[PDB]
Write an enzyme that holds these catalytic residues in place. Sequence first.
Site, PDB file in Angstrom:
ATOM      1  N   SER A   1     -23.007  74.777 -17.295  1.00 15.23           N
ATOM      2  CA  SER A   1     -23.338  75.846 -16.373  1.00 15.23           C
ATOM      3  C   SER A   1     -24.316  76.799 -17.043  1.00 15.23           C
ATOM      4  CB  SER A   1     -22.064  76.583 -15.975  1.00 15.23           C
ATOM      5  OG  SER A   1     -22.345  77.727 -15.198  1.00 15.23           O
TER       6      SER A   1
ATOM      7  N   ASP B   1      -8.341  62.385  -9.521  1.00  8.74           N
ATOM      8  CA  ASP B   1      -8.483  63.171 -10.745  1.00  8.74           C
ATOM      9  C   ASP B   1      -9.745  62.781 -11.513  1.00  8.74           C
ATOM     10  OD1 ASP B   1      -8.164  64.627 -13.053  1.00  8.74           O
ATOM     11  OD2 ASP B   1      -6.434  63.486 -13.813  1.00  8.74           O
TER      12      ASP B   1
END
Length: 330
Positions: free
Chosen positions: A199, A35
């Site tokens: 992004s 994770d």
Amino acid sequence: STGSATTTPIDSLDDAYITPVQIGTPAQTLNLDFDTGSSDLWVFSSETTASEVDGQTIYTPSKSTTAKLLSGATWSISYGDGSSSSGDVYTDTVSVGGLTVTGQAVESAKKVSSSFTEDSTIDGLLGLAFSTLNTVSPTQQKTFFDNAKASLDSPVFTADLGYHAPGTYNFGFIDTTAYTGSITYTAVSTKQGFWEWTSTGYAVGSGTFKSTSIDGIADTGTTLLYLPATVVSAYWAQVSGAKSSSSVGGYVFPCSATLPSFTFGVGSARIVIPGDYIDFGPISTGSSSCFGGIQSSAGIGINIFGDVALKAAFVVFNGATTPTLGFASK
């Protein structure tokens, strides 16, 4: 040194991925959920409330000759999906795919929430976010990667998750046969303890690319892709019959649909998520309403590039002094 381990979807939907981890002496192999959105390595154990164990493999520290109780240390964690666990702490030898750390903090669960009990395939979590998020008290502990870093050939790990198929976590090297083209690297902020990056935009299907900054985290421990409501609305508007359902808890779509791809930007590069990756199947057994793999982050407080996004790429988690993230197509 290096390590290399296969990671395997837990079910037919790729709801999560498990990777075998050797703990203790002799080895006790547990299947952990790696994770990159948290920083605790915790396990089902001989100390876990019996009624809260249902099929998981447990770590039994008393059977390990290298286990040592970390005196006074406790831990308690809550995850974004509302699940939680807590307990005490041992140090022990932990190996992943041939890479060994001695004195790793192994957080032994005394209590786990229902979500964990109900998932027989996940024996615990191995956190790969920054150690500043580790919950051990009163002395915070380091992640497996943090402990291994100085010994690695290169201070990196990579995530290569499969679509409906196994993949690979590598530590200490970049497998240049595992991706196509080039790896594009992008800046990371560690201010919230995550692999947080921005992004450069998105496209829906064959549509034109929208240049826009989307701050989010690279999180292998989250199944879906969580993005701003505007982006998500634009995606589902291209699927006839798709709608946001408050009763279901997100966007659903007719199971008869053919889903369009979703592209996200990494610098000037582009990662394409095929439409099939966005199908999470019937909302309930036998239903013709299917759950979407792209969902709104509104009210999460952060955008999450979860498995839906990451499995479309070869992803480098670069733990150099100034960390960065790399993405390649594959």
